[PDB]
Amino acid sequence: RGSHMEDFVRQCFNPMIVELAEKAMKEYGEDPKIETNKFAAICTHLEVCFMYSDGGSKHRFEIIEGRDRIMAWTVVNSICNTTGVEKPKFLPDLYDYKENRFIDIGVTRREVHIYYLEKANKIKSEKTHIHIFSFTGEEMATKADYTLDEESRARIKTRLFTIRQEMASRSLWDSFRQSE
Ligand SMILES: COc1cc2c(cc1OC)CC(NC(=O)c1nc([C@@H]3CCCN3C(=O)CSc3ccccc3Cl)[nH]c(=O)c1O)C2
Ligand SMILES: [Mn+2]
Ligand SMILES: [Mn+2]
């Protein structure tokens, strides 16, 4: 029962990101062929995380998203037992070696305020930095500290709005926005 959303996801994101998203969905018992809006959202989240790691210096960020559950937690404990940062209760997306903190990146179709509120109470980790991006071009980070310079963030927001235009041109945006 191949959907229009599935074929769009594959010719919109690069094969390596599609591969990682398929593995992440299948690991937690989900099928990219059926729950296709979630397939698109994980690909989007993965690409943003990768563009985000690109923004800093060469060795600024340790990428934890995109790893399997076991190795991702292995890297977290290595970072904790080396830098003394508190071990987060839930998996973050990156570690900032410059600012010495874990980052969880959020990509939402709702208002940045609402999504941020939920990620704060859910993570419950006082130390984990939070950075939210929306498909409309707004962002919101912990303590108003946006980590990267403006140009690296603007590149992410441009890509996010391009993705939304591409789904809107194929009439899949409405079903995607109504899926979150
Ligand atoms: C399936 O259960 C869990 C899975 C995972 C975690 C925890 C889970 O519960 C025990 C940690 C990790 N989640 C994130 O890294 C993360 N998750 C989100 C959103 C809102 C919070 C839950 N969520 C999901 O997507 C869950 S489903 C899912 C997740 C990844 C791949 C495939 C699927 Cl199907 N938003 C982010 O910005 C973000 O970084 C993977
Ligand atoms: Mn994550
Ligand atoms: Mn995240």
UniProtKB/Swiss-Prot annotation:
Processing and modification events after translation: Phosphorylated on serines and threonines by host kinases, including human casein kinase II.
Highest rank taxon of the organism: Viruses
Binding site for Mn(2+) 1: 45, 65, 93, 104-105
Residues at the catalytic site: 119
Motif window: Nuclear localization signal 1 (NLS1): 109-124
Cell compartment(s), UniProt: Host cytoplasm; Host nucleus
Effect seen on changing residue 42 to T: RO-7 resistant, reduced affinity for Baloxavir and Baloxavir marboxil
Annotated positions binding Mn(2+) 2: 65, 93
Annotated consequence of substituting residue 27 to K: Reduced affinity for Baloxavir and Baloxavir marboxil
Quaternary organization: Influenza RNA polymerase is composed of three subunits: PB1, PB2 and PA. Interacts (via C-terminus) with PB1 (via N-terminus).
Family from the record: Belongs to the influenza viruses PA family.
Main function: Plays an essential role in viral RNA transcription and replication by forming the heterotrimeric polymerase complex together with PB1 and PB2 subunits. The complex transcribes viral mRNAs by using a unique mechanism called cap-snatching. It consists in the hijacking and cleavage of host capped pre-mRNAs. These short capped RNAs are then used as primers for viral mRNAs. The PB2 subunit is responsible for the binding of the 5' cap of cellular pre-mRNAs which are subsequently cleaved after 10-13 nucleotides by the PA subunit that carries the endonuclease activity.
Protein name, as recorded: Polymerase acidic protein
Organism lineage: Viruses, Riboviria, Orthornavirae, Negarnaviricota, Polyploviricotina
Gene field: PA
